[PDB]
């Protein structure tokens, strides 16, 4: 599904070229860059010792954070608000990143764990994490 | 979340009156009627011996079928297509209806069971069912 008025917001993209943007050019730009994330793992793919069991793509946390900021700064506020709430709040996805082994949490916003505890004595390993609420 | 361009498509509605419709007046009309379904059970509600464990409203199958036809017949085809695919294909919801106790299936379209088998000798009971694909 791709959100009408955009070419890149949703599963994959329906752009005819790498540089095409939709009607909502600010919101779509944020999704375009998101889709072009250097490190992603497709549905059912296995990477960094992890495996994405979702029916949608899951990306590195760096890309997901940049996406968050992009949307919050987008001039197309109505469509960005919709895409932002959907992605970060309603589809219950996760991102991966290299971090010290996690030990605990302090539900920095219930439902999800934003200030988890790590063991700083053990080398970093790829793990799954919750996103901030939009 | 409510789909921009509509007042009724999404959780609840953001209409100011019972008769207000959004920009996409044909798509929105279909959602308005859907929301006004005589028999629904709110998130976590218990009804007809069933209980809705979803975080969204689940309605009777009659309403969900009427909604399907409404969308397929809507003049606002782009927004109806999006709302149709999302609701019937991606959120994995269910509807309830009075039917003979179910016994089996014949995945009338994989992922979901459209031609289930019933025991016609036992009185009808409310049960949960899959929706058609849009
Ligand atoms: C009800 C369930 C439907 C959920 C849809 C899942 C979208 C997947 O988000 C990942 C992609 C990024 O992954 P791909 O597009 O697969 O990545 C490109 C890598 N080839 O993010 P985006 O930036 O395109 C996200 C937009 C969601 C907005 C909601 C409006 C419908
Ligand atoms: C990623 C997860 C998000 C899923 C959103 C769940 C929507 C609930 O559909 C039920 C209502 C009907 O229930 P209520 O609106 O709660 O019913 C009114 C009863 N007071 O249907 P509608 O006709 O309003 C459905 C539209 C979904 C379209 C997607 C675009 C965002
Ligand atoms: Ca995309
Ligand atoms: Ca609604």
């Amino acid at each position: 599904i791709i959100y009408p008025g955009t070419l890149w917001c949703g599963h994959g993209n329906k752009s005819s070229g790498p540089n095409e943007l939709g009607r909502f050019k600010h919101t779509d730009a944020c999704c375009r860059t998101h889709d072009m994330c250097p490190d992603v793992m497709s549905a059912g793919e296995s990477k960094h010792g992890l495996t994405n069991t979702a029916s949608h793509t899951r990306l590195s946390c760096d890309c997901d954070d940049k996406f968050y900021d992009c949307l919050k700064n987008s001039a197309d506020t109505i469509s960005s608000y919709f895409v932002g709430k959907m992605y970060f709040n309603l589809i219950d996805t996760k991102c991966y990143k290299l971090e010290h082994p996690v030990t605990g949490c302090g539900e920095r916003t219930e439902g999800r764990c934003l200030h988890y505890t790590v063991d700083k004595s053990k080398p970093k390993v790829y793990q799954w994490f919750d996103l901030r609420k939009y």
Side-chain angles (χ1 to χ4, degrees), chain A residues 2-56:
Chain A
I2 281 125
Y3 177 67
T6 73
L7 291 188
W8 305 81
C9 299
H11 303 84
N13 75 90
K14 71 181 211 243
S15 175
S16 70
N19 296 324
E20 246 231 299
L21 291 182
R23 176 163 155 228
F24 300 131
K25 55 145 113 213
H26 302 303
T27 291
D28 206 16
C30 279
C31 293
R32 185 180 164 274
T33 293
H34 197 221
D35 275 25
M36 280 174 188
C37 175
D39 197 354
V40 299
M41 44 174 100
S42 304
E45 183 181 336
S46 266
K47 235 181 165 188
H48 309 300
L50 305 180
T51 145
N52 179 14
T53 64
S55 54
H56 53 86

Side-chain angles (χ1 to χ4, degrees), chain A residues 70-109:
Chain A
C70 199
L71 286 178
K72 286 275 187 191
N73 262 82
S74 171
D76 297 331
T77 135
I78 291 181
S79 62
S80 280
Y81 188 68
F82 177 80
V83 170
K85 296 265 272 356
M86 281 278 333
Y87 188 78
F88 289 99
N89 295 358
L90 297 174
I91 59 166
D92 277 325
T93 196
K94 307 250 196 261
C95 64
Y96 56 90
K97 104 228 223 201
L98 197 61
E99 177 59 296
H100 292 291
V102 174
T103 61
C105 183
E107 311 251 331
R108 294 294 15 117
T109 192

